Amino acid sequence: GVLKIVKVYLAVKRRIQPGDKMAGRHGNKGVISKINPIEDMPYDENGTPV
Amino acid sequence: FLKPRLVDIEQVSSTHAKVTLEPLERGFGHTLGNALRRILLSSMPGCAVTEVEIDGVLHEYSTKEGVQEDILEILLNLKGLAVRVQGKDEVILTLNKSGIGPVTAADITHDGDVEIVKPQHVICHLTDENASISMRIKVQRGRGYVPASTRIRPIGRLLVDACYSPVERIAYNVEAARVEQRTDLDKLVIEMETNGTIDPEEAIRRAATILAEQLEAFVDL
Amino acid sequence: VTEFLKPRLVDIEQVSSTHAKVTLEPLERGFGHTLGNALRRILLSSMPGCAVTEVE
Secondary structure, eight states, rough: OOOOOOOOOOOOOOOOOOOOOOOTTOOOOOEEOOOOOGGGGGTTTTBBBB | OOOOOOOEOOOOOOSEEEEOOOOOOOHHHHHHHHHHHHHHHHHHHHHHHEEEEEEEOTTTOOTTTTTOOOOHHHHHHHOOOOEOOOOEEEEEEEEEEEEEEEGGGEEEEESSEESSSSSSSSEEESTTTTTTEEEEEEEOOEOOOOHHHHHOOOEEEEEEOOOOOOOOEEEEEEEOOOOSOOOOOEEEEOEEOOSSSSHHHHHHHHHHHHHHHHTTTTTTO | OOOOOOOOOOOOOOOOOTTBOOSSSSSOHHHHHHHHHHHHHHHOOOOOOOOOOOOO
């Protein structure tokens, strides 16, 4: 009882967002709270922000 | 008080230089260095690519024969190229390549004003003998980072996330100066890292204008 | 590209003359911290003022 079936494949590019569940390999899991601008990041003497 | 000046600009490498400001007193050194670093990393007018059209690629996720990698990796490599323009705020770059060989940025049919500062930046590798890729790269100036999902037509147009940020690593050091006769004077050296699209002197001078204008809320120029 | 959202004073709550609370609404992203820290250091570490230094 069907005529024809149309399958449409949608590719979603989900960027990292506040709330996305990010977790390391050692059981440390956390939700991203804020996407802090790079100028606000702690930088070492070399200037590379973490 | 004392006025910092462009005492020296040590262009140590093609990408990153070492600018020096000489006259500064207690606090000024660190304050001015941190303010300049934040202004540079926050809002510096870059000229990153923002829109790409391929000759025969329908969408971002398809693949044309003869190319080493996906079109998505081609777009991400395109985002990485450092390009600076002089006159036009908007410019369209046409890339036509044929035959086996990596498609570096050097083969881009540049206009009179637009020029690639890193011609060695590879975009894609052509593999088949009769493999040709023809892309129309749309490059426009801008400030900060704006993704393609938060902006504003044909199905064949591909959107690449904009990365208008010439600077990538700004490090400043505050150390004592070598004035003729005085103490408590420090020199500020900024180890700014750029992709090559901005002159460190004009970048520093622009950052100060942005800070001075923001300061103008409480100070008459 | 050089245009910026220059702040405009919106309401400066005038507490007694020994205290004040100045605020700006528009400004720019990341520029609030820059201006705040710059002003704080610039007026907290170096200002022309007169105070006692030595008593006998």
